Design a protein around this ligand. Structure first.
Ligand code: HEM
Ligand code: HEM
Lengths: 153, 153
């Protein structure tokens, strides 16, 4: 992962990206397509763009740059928000409480049991399967943080 | 992973948790501690509790259940938000556009170059290192989805 300061630095420069997203996106795609022309071959709708000049003149290349950098920014922000939720929990459960993954399994099963007991009319088989999967992701994600922190869970 | 409706089911039932978070948290920990009594040994303040009635009467246990379910809720919500944007991108770039991870590396290189060129004051060595790390996390998270989908990338 990234430190808090590092994520701050990523978000600060990304603010500069957002002040001119289309210009940035245009420049990123042109750099990509000039450096690695095979990548431009992936875009059938840019088949008419061959030269740098034509790439710079393209309305739709610029528009696509915006699409790309808007999507990337959102994913980077959402990753950071998730990492920040995991962080304090992994910290303490790895380095202080030392909670094995098998105990996280036991609490996950408890949660499913309680949900079924308290909401049998609204926590059917499908919804139960959804929660079972979400809790497995949660445990896997903590297990990956445990490893980063040096703890074998 | 979860489909979109599965995530929604997770969010929906957590809303129900949040309407009686105390009761839900109490029941979760009672289930855990009665099913797996060894887990009680982790809790200095609970490990004396033997019966369900005693566990229900403990204000400390009840308080803790709330703390646990609050924390888990925030992780689940933030995972869901990240997945909602990550999933469609991995899906289209594996299935339709067929974009190898190496081409994501190439566009990462272009992003790092463009940011350094445009914003050197906000993109010194540490800040660049942070962005390099954040784009690797992005690529790795797409690669994991690619493996789930059977796409070589
Ligand atoms: C930071 C990495 C990237 C992001 C965030 C990104 C984002 C997007 C988004 C949001 C779309 C539109 C919706 C969709 O189809 O998913 C799209 C379309 C597409 N992407 Fe990407 N992309 C990335 C990298 C690449 C790379 C490296 C290539 C090719 C070498 C590529 C090729 C395409 C193609 C061919 C389309 C469809 C274009 C069209 O005909 O409109 N992507 N991308
Ligand atoms: C859904 C899974 C879990 C969640 C969300 C969770 C959450 C929390 C939170 C938010 C705290 C307080 C702040 C902190 O120390 O991080 C905490 C404390 C603690 N947790 Fe967990 N926990 C989970 C599972 C477990 C399990 C299974 C065990 C043991 C079997 C455990 C043992 C402890 C202990 C011993 C403390 C300290 C209690 C105290 O001194 O007051 N946790 N947990």
């Amino acid at each position: 992962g990234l430190s808090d300061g590092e994520w701050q630095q990523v978000l600060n420069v990304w603010g500069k990206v957002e002040a001119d997203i289309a210009g940035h996106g245009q420049e990123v795609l042109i750099r990509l397509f000039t450096g690695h022309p095979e990548t431009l071959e992936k875009f059938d709708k840019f088949k008419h763009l061959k030269t740098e000049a034509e790439m710079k003149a393209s309305e739709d290349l610029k528009k696509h740059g915006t699409v790309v950098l808007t999507a990337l920014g959102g994913i980077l922000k959402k990753k950071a928000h998730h990492e920040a939720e995991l962080k304090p929990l992994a910290q303490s459960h790895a380095t202080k409480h030392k909670i094995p993954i098998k105990y996280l399994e036991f609490i996950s099963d408890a949660i499913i049991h309680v949900l079924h007991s308290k909401h049998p009319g609204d926590f059917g088989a499908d919804a139960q399967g959804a929660m079972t999967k979400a809790l497995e992701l949660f445990r896997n994600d903590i297990a990956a943080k445990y490893k980063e922190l040096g703890f074998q869970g």
